[PDB]
Amino acid sequence: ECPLSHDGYCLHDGVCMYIEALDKYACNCVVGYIGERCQYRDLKWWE
Amino acid sequence: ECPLSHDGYCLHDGVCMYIEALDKYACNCVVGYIGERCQYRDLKWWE
Amino acid sequence: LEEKKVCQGTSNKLTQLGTFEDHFLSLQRMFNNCEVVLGNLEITYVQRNYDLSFLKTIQEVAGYVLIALNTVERIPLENLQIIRGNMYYENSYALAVLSNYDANKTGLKELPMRNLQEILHGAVRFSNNPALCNVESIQWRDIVSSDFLSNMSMDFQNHLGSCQKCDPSCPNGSCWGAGEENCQKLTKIICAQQCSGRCRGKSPSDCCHNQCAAGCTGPRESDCLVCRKFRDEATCKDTCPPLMLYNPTTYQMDVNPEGKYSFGATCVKKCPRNYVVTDHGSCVRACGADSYEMEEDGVRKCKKCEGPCRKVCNGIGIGEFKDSLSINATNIKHFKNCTSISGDLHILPVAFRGDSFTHTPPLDPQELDILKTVKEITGFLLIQAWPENRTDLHAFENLEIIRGRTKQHGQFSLAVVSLNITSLGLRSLKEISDGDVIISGNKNLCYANTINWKKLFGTSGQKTKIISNRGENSCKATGQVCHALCSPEGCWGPEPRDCVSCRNVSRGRECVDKCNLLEGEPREFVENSECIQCHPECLPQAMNITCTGRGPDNCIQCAHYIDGPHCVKTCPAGVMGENNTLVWKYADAGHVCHLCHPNCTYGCTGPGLEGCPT
Amino acid sequence: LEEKKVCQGTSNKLTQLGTFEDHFLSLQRMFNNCEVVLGNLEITYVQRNYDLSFLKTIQEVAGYVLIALNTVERIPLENLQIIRGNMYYENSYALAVLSNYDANKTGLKELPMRNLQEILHGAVRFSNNPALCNVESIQWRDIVSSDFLSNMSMDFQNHLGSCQKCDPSCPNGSCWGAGEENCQKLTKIICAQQCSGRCRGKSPSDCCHNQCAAGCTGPRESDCLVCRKFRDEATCKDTCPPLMLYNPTTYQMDVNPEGKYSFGATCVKKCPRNYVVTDHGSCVRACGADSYEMEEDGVRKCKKCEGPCRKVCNGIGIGEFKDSLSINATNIKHFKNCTSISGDLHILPVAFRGDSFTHTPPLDPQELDILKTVKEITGFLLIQAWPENRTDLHAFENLEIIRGRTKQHGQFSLAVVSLNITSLGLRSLKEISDGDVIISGNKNLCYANTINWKKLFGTSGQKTKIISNRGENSCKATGQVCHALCSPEGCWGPEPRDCVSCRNVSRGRECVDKCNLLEGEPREFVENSECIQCHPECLPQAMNITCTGRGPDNCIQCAHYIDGPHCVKTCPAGVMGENNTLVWKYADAGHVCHLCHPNCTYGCTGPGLEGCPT
Amino acid sequence: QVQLQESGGGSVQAGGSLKLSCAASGRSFSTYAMGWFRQAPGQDREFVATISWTDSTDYADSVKGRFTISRDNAKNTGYLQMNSLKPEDTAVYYCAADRWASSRRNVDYDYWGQGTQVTVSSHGSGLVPR
Amino acid sequence: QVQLQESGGGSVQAGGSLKLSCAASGRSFSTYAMGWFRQAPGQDREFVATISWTDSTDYADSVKGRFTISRDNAKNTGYLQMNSLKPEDTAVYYCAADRWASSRRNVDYDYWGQGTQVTVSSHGSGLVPR
Ligand SMILES: *[C@@H]1O[C@H](CO)[C@@H](O)[C@H](O)[C@H]1NC(C)=O
Ligand SMILES: *[C@@H]1O[C@H](CO)[C@@H](O)[C@H](O)[C@H]1NC(C)=O
Ligand SMILES: *[C@@H]1O[C@H](CO)[C@@H](O)[C@H](O)[C@H]1NC(C)=O
Ligand SMILES: *[C@@H]1O[C@H](CO)[C@@H](O)[C@H](O)[C@H]1NC(C)=O
Ligand SMILES: *[C@@H]1O[C@H](CO)[C@@H](O)[C@H](O)[C@H]1NC(C)=O
Ligand SMILES: *[C@@H]1O[C@H](CO)[C@@H](O)[C@H](O)[C@H]1NC(C)=O
Ligand SMILES: *[C@@H]1O[C@H](CO)[C@@H](O)[C@H](O)[C@H]1NC(C)=O
Ligand SMILES: *[C@@H]1O[C@H](CO)[C@@H](O)[C@H](O)[C@H]1NC(C)=O
Ligand SMILES: *[C@@H]1O[C@H](CO)[C@@H](O)[C@H](O)[C@H]1NC(C)=O
Ligand SMILES: *[C@@H]1O[C@H](CO)[C@@H](O)[C@H](O)[C@H]1NC(C)=O
Ligand SMILES: *[C@@H]1O[C@H](CO)[C@@H](O)[C@H](O)[C@H]1NC(C)=O
Ligand SMILES: *[C@@H]1O[C@H](CO)[C@@H](O)[C@H](O)[C@H]1NC(C)=O
Ligand SMILES: *[C@@H]1O[C@H](CO)[C@@H](O)[C@H](O)[C@H]1NC(C)=O
Ligand SMILES: *[C@@H]1O[C@H](CO)[C@@H](O)[C@H](O)[C@H]1NC(C)=O
């Protein structure tokens, strides 16, 4: 549902999601990968 | 009037004088020479 | 408890980790039994119910707080007292409370944060709070600092109108929730003119010290509820008394027993080992442009550097490379002659493939040579990608120490995961001052769990987590274990040059069995379990040892001519004599040197006049 | 008035200068219109009457006060407010009030010191005060600091009993004198528990800042009557905010606008030129054992000294030679390799003749050579004796600068009086950073009033008092004026080596007319109005100049052989070639050098094989 | 962030009754707590009364039980009924407001009305207050 | 630098009269200002009265006009006449002294007497104080 500008921004299976609240965009990272671009690995648990 | 111990202690014409107040001794320096042994010259006036 | 038990906190903002439960659980794990929050309180995506008992214990937060998209009814943060708020939400507010509602008009309702009474810096945000009740009545000026009330943009839109009604006895109808306890506790507005800072009551006696934050229990400087600037044991100080007091009388410096070191918010008498100690008397983390890290009897000191300086190359995500969130084709350029890396190193996947969004060229695998210059890193290292071309970590051949003063999540000085590399090949890495080591998620990486880490760790609490690496079962079959020449202590790879410590001796960097004393091409000597080559003058001896030292002074026999134990090329001509007068000597059949007769100008071929015809 | 007008004060204690009038007059001269007393208030030998109006204006005293043997009736020190008292009377008391009586039972009577309300340090002494009245009623605890009340030994023996009776309305019968104004003003005892420091009234609002001394006019830090530690303009501070604030967040240092320099009791932005500036950020007077005075772009800085240090030789009457009150045979020993004199130099008569009292041997006139090592003096110089043997001041040949940070009576950096010397002979003295110059009482000292002092003075307010020295009338008759070669600017003696600046040129230290260019023994060149001798290689030229530089590179013609403009002793043998290979050249009848043929081992006497027979 | 203005200041007989008002010049009146302050001529400015933006009243002890502050959100106005007046009441009256506080300190209200003179006749004309 | 000791502490009827005394154990009595202090049981220690070494009296307001402190240099003693006693007087009484101060602060007197219990009967037995 994201425009072309922000489409394909997130890495490691991140998906663009529309922040209705204040008309923004963000990434929905998979479990065990964190950061706004899903770049940082969970260090404390699961390797 | 000074005992032998303190007699002839002061320089530049200083003379032993007996401090009755607390039983001490001191020097009576001439005008224009200062210090307890009459060693320092008056610097601000009279050379 | 002397100190309060801490949790690291997160800066991910609106990143949802999978589903709502998954994120909620990551939160629960993180902030369970947390007393003081080091990072930020990101209460996002808290759906209906999801009881948050464990959060009650949270007292304060260094950074900003983001409460967003929480349809939950009750958020009991009663013991939350203060927010330092050194960071702002989008450079605007210390607290952001937004969109706490569901489609069915159920949102944040109860919020009895009766003890939250101070916010040092930053503003607050309110919007889209239909269900919100009670909190409305809060007279914020008591809490928030005067500087920001213009920046504060908040609004209570109680559309529903299903709300509770404050207990009458509450101070002027200001209450956090039902009951007498939830009445808003104000300790700022009732401080009479005289009291500039916080106060207990109106009676002028109750003037708290200026240096108190949340309030006080008495006028004395120790009685502050929360220390504003520094927490020197009970007392709350502004700046640690310097090492020496300036003497007004003599215009000199006198050693001060009160003298202490400013480490963050603590006046202590001793810094953590790894941290840099200044002559100023404050524990610091890195030298500025003025000077470099001068080793001063086993502690780092920023002794002034004359003329050209070693300087400091701002590590990624710090100073001049804070914009960049991973070393890519662009920023890597500025690493020509880097000796001290004042920051961190983030090697992310996007760097290599290139980012359309930021318009960053693909990082060339060939450009990994730049890293040879790097010798030390103040902070930590993260590597989440490596080129197909290379399997060995050549780039870090001459990487010596990782200071790791700043750690990723204050826990780890190094992280290598999800890589394709096979051999570690770090043959100068001999110290990690502080910080933990985590090696995981490497498919075909042997040599991982072979090193003796206790040697490399110097500080109490350095842990090691090396899991999900190529099992020794497989590695040993294909001979990817410590080579014959590597000591059992540890080995970085299969090569003899990758051994931590050698069994017996070594030729330079490569371990070997025994030095070439008797025969062999390089005639060498054994010093400190190393073989060093004799000076060419040292004549090789078939049976006897050739030499016992680098210089030509220790040769048993000379290759050409002899002038004592010091083997010289030829009989000295012009050797230091009387006031630097040239001295002429003559060679003999037995290679013996003797002085010529003064007469012979063109040298002499014998004693006296008979030596030199013309 | 920005600052208060100061008087230097005296430490002579019971030294009576001639008769009572003479001493009284010395006092009057000193303390007339004095606002703040730098030294000590020695009110001794004040006889009947001798009206002391001028003393009223005195406000405070840095040091102790001695009121002794004063038979005077009235001593109106009403505006005297406080005594810092950094020095004690005989290491005991801040104020000593003793033996104020005459034979006829007339002594100190009125003493309405109504404004004297604080004493930071030291105790007080009272005894032999028959006539004393009113003062008795003073409840001292208000004034004196708690630490000393045990050391305080005072007694009111009002034997006479002819005394006044305090005005009823005075606070509990405590009065300094007659009238409502003279009621003792107490600002300490009525400070309720809450107020730890001084106060205006009992109402808790009136809590003065801790940093106030005499009291306050309000709670703010600026409102203090007298600043306890530092007087930063209106405000009264504890220690100047350091140059840079320690950043709690980043664990770094951030440049502080508030950052100032602690110079005595003042937080300023700039030190007096002569004074040493530390990287710490406080104006100081001398370096400790740690380091010496490193010249850092025209300001003194105590940059750390590696290994052996130049060190500092404690000048007389300071540190390790404070006992000694004049350099004598004993202390002079410890001046072997003194480069920096951290203190003063007192040359008194008793040193030379020797003191029976202190058992100090006579100072040997021959031992004056020790002073050649001395190069600089932090403080001042006093010379009141000189041996008969020498008339010239050889001892100070290499005395360069007198820093004079500490001055005798804060007024004079140098003093030479009542000497027998004839010529100054100070031929390295080229700067007096600060402090005045007084030359007087020299019987037969010429050259005195010939120097251009404005050049040598670098600071505003450096005066010159040169009087009662040998008149030029007499000096010129016997030719004791600036020699022909000395510039009119100034001259230290009749010798050509004692000129401040030379007319034209100079051979080393001795001025001359013109350099030996054309003829003469030393063939020399003229650089920067100096004649320097050519290297021996430079062949003397009858008509042309010989050389234009020190090194042999600038000789017009070579004495022996020539190898270009660089005149070498002989054709180079072994000059730097290929990888430091010896090069053999051959001389010719024309003194030209050319390369030999490789074949000739023993050198060559011609080109090719034909050159070198054997 | 809005202006204010008073009305009703004038002269009255000792022991009379009066009705003062304070009209807000702007918007969001309901969001602002309202406070009254007085300064006796030749004295310092002192607190009178207040009422929170949460409609919580609070009086100074002198005027307590003789004064009745109030507010009308619809009309964006405030009122002050004043009975059993005393010659001591004569002063210059101001009304301040603020959204984020309902305190009593003159410093905490940073948006001010311009004020009016209020006078109560001398003892001579009237009676001795109770 | 000298010791002290009280006398006269005991029980009395509400509204009665009593006479307390404080004897100095040492020398230079004339040089010491004398002060009385009281502590109501289960309360904090509070000031009562004082008289300077310069013979200047000073009372606390509670006891003012009901109490009369005094001193006798010859006998090295002090006295305290106490009339129209109140049940509120029941407390532990001390007497302190000091040469260099005649203040009211308990901290400024650093040489102390050991004290005595003083009791005034309950309202029941007597009358309601005036
Ligand atoms: C928090 O940690 C404790 C440790 O004993 C554990 O028992 C508990 O289940 C965790 N979670 C909560 C919500 O307390
Ligand atoms: C919270 O309530 C929901 C109902 O919406 C329920 O499904 C869930 O089990 C509850 N969670 C816990 C942890 O009890
Ligand atoms: C207010 O917020 C703006 C951005 O919205 C920011 O530039 C500014 O620094 C803030 N002011 C204060 C005083 O925090
Ligand atoms: C790439 O590096 C440049 C230079 O520091 C930086 O501006 C940019 O944000 C970086 N982009 C990524 C995706 O790391
Ligand atoms: C620094 O640059 C110089 C250039 O003169 C170079 O020779 C040297 O290899 C460099 N050193 C390091 C440590 O990068
Ligand atoms: C991993 O590295 C090896 C090294 O030879 C290479 O052959 C292989 O292609 C790499 N794997 C990937 C997925 O790039
Ligand atoms: C090291 O020396 C020991 C000493 O006997 C020897 O046994 C061993 O073989 C040597 N190491 C190697 C790799 O040869
Ligand atoms: C003090 O100095 C002033 C300066 O004008 C002079 O007139 C006066 O005679 C001096 N002595 C006294 C006692 O004022
Ligand atoms: C002070 O009084 C004496 C009388 O003993 C008198 O001789 C003298 O002249 C007076 N001094 C002055 C300065 O008036
Ligand atoms: C008291 O005086 C003695 C000498 O009489 C001295 O040693 C000591 O330092 C003094 N004590 C204080 C607290 O000044
Ligand atoms: C002489 O010098 C010694 C050594 O410093 C010192 O003890 C003594 O007081 C001095 N005597 C005189 C008279 O200067
Ligand atoms: C210091 O002592 C050394 C002894 O090695 C001596 O050669 C030198 O002349 C001395 N220097 C000075 C400045 O006194
Ligand atoms: C003064 O010095 C001269 C120098 O020659 C000497 O002749 C003379 O004796 C000295 N005078 C005295 C009084 O020592
Ligand atoms: C210095 O040079 C000038 C230049 O003409 C000359 O007149 C003078 O004589 C020289 N000085 C001396 C002392 O000869």
PDB file of C-alpha atoms in Angstrom, chain D residues 183-262:
ATOM      1  CA  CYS D 183      25.239  48.673  69.982  1.00  0.00           C
ATOM      2  CA  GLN D 184      26.957  45.442  68.952  1.00  0.00           C
ATOM      3  CA  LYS D 185      25.644  44.336  65.553  1.00  0.00           C
ATOM      4  CA  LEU D 186      25.233  40.547  65.583  1.00  0.00           C
ATOM      5  CA  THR D 187      24.358  38.690  62.370  1.00  0.00           C
ATOM      6  CA  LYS D 188      25.409  35.113  63.278  1.00  0.00           C
ATOM      7  CA  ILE D 189      23.653  34.004  66.474  1.00  0.00           C
ATOM      8  CA  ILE D 190      20.138  34.884  65.235  1.00  0.00           C
ATOM      9  CA  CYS D 191      20.479  32.649  62.164  1.00  0.00           C
ATOM     10  CA  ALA D 192      17.889  29.935  62.857  1.00  0.00           C
ATOM     11  CA  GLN D 193      18.827  26.244  62.490  1.00  0.00           C
ATOM     12  CA  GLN D 194      17.848  26.267  58.802  1.00  0.00           C
ATOM     13  CA  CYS D 195      20.342  29.006  57.897  1.00  0.00           C
ATOM     14  CA  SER D 196      23.785  27.413  58.172  1.00  0.00           C
ATOM     15  CA  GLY D 197      25.612  30.560  57.052  1.00  0.00           C
ATOM     16  CA  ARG D 198      25.137  34.220  57.832  1.00  0.00           C
ATOM     17  CA  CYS D 199      21.775  35.966  57.958  1.00  0.00           C
ATOM     18  CA  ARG D 200      20.085  39.360  58.028  1.00  0.00           C
ATOM     19  CA  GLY D 201      17.237  38.505  60.408  1.00  0.00           C
ATOM     20  CA  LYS D 202      15.468  35.599  62.095  1.00  0.00           C
ATOM     21  CA  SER D 203      12.713  35.230  59.466  1.00  0.00           C
ATOM     22  CA  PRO D 204      13.755  32.096  57.484  1.00  0.00           C
ATOM     23  CA  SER D 205      13.645  34.136  54.262  1.00  0.00           C
ATOM     24  CA  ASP D 206      16.856  35.883  55.354  1.00  0.00           C
ATOM     25  CA  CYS D 207      19.120  32.832  54.913  1.00  0.00           C
ATOM     26  CA  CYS D 208      22.229  34.267  53.267  1.00  0.00           C
ATOM     27  CA  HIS D 209      24.231  32.208  50.799  1.00  0.00           C
ATOM     28  CA  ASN D 210      26.911  30.049  52.412  1.00  0.00           C
ATOM     29  CA  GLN D 211      29.509  31.906  50.307  1.00  0.00           C
ATOM     30  CA  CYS D 212      28.971  35.178  52.202  1.00  0.00           C
ATOM     31  CA  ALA D 213      31.399  36.349  54.891  1.00  0.00           C
ATOM     32  CA  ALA D 214      30.200  39.509  56.674  1.00  0.00           C
ATOM     33  CA  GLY D 215      26.524  38.869  55.858  1.00  0.00           C
ATOM     34  CA  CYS D 216      24.240  39.667  52.956  1.00  0.00           C
ATOM     35  CA  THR D 217      21.602  42.033  51.610  1.00  0.00           C
ATOM     36  CA  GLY D 218      19.532  39.195  50.141  1.00  0.00           C
ATOM     37  CA  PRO D 219      19.680  35.471  49.379  1.00  0.00           C
ATOM     38  CA  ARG D 220      21.234  35.777  45.906  1.00  0.00           C
ATOM     39  CA  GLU D 221      24.898  34.840  45.510  1.00  0.00           C
ATOM     40  CA  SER D 222      25.853  38.375  44.422  1.00  0.00           C
ATOM     41  CA  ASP D 223      24.343  40.088  47.480  1.00  0.00           C
ATOM     42  CA  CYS D 224      27.117  39.014  49.882  1.00  0.00           C
ATOM     43  CA  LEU D 225      28.625  41.924  51.797  1.00  0.00           C
ATOM     44  CA  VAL D 226      32.120  40.417  51.471  1.00  0.00           C
ATOM     45  CA  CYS D 227      32.983  37.509  49.181  1.00  0.00           C
ATOM     46  CA  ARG D 228      34.348  34.562  51.158  1.00  0.00           C
ATOM     47  CA  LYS D 229      36.592  32.885  48.569  1.00  0.00           C
ATOM     48  CA  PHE D 230      36.390  34.670  45.200  1.00  0.00           C
ATOM     49  CA  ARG D 231      34.919  38.011  44.097  1.00  0.00           C
ATOM     50  CA  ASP D 232      33.783  37.493  40.505  1.00  0.00           C
ATOM     51  CA  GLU D 233      32.484  41.052  39.949  1.00  0.00           C
ATOM     52  CA  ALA D 234      29.374  41.350  42.175  1.00  0.00           C
ATOM     53  CA  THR D 235      29.065  37.582  42.603  1.00  0.00           C
ATOM     54  CA  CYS D 236      30.983  35.664  45.276  1.00  0.00           C
ATOM     55  CA  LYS D 237      32.217  32.286  44.066  1.00  0.00           C
ATOM     56  CA  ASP D 238      33.973  29.234  45.497  1.00  0.00           C
ATOM     57  CA  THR D 239      36.140  28.264  42.512  1.00  0.00           C
ATOM     58  CA  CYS D 240      36.169  29.639  38.974  1.00  0.00           C
ATOM     59  CA  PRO D 241      34.288  27.359  36.535  1.00  0.00           C
ATOM     60  CA  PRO D 242      37.104  25.457  34.768  1.00  0.00           C
ATOM     61  CA  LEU D 243      37.964  26.138  31.128  1.00  0.00           C
ATOM     62  CA  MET D 244      35.790  23.261  29.882  1.00  0.00           C
ATOM     63  CA  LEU D 245      32.800  21.459  31.368  1.00  0.00           C
ATOM     64  CA  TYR D 246      32.997  17.684  31.650  1.00  0.00           C
ATOM     65  CA  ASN D 247      30.105  16.385  29.508  1.00  0.00           C
ATOM     66  CA  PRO D 248      28.230  13.657  31.451  1.00  0.00           C
ATOM     67  CA  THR D 249      26.672  12.260  28.264  1.00  0.00           C
ATOM     68  CA  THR D 250      29.606  11.833  25.867  1.00  0.00           C
ATOM     69  CA  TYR D 251      32.299  11.539  28.585  1.00  0.00           C
ATOM     70  CA  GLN D 252      34.244  14.329  26.871  1.00  0.00           C
ATOM     71  CA  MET D 253      35.121  17.988  27.521  1.00  0.00           C
ATOM     72  CA  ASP D 254      33.061  20.867  26.093  1.00  0.00           C
ATOM     73  CA  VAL D 255      34.382  24.427  25.834  1.00  0.00           C
ATOM     74  CA  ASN D 256      32.787  26.496  28.601  1.00  0.00           C
ATOM     75  CA  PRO D 257      31.965  30.203  28.146  1.00  0.00           C
ATOM     76  CA  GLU D 258      31.729  30.419  31.948  1.00  0.00           C
ATOM     77  CA  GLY D 259      35.309  29.077  32.069  1.00  0.00           C
ATOM     78  CA  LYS D 260      37.621  31.513  33.851  1.00  0.00           C
ATOM     79  CA  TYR D 261      41.057  31.784  35.450  1.00  0.00           C
ATOM     80  CA  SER D 262      41.542  31.764  39.235  1.00  0.00           C
TER      81      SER D 262
END
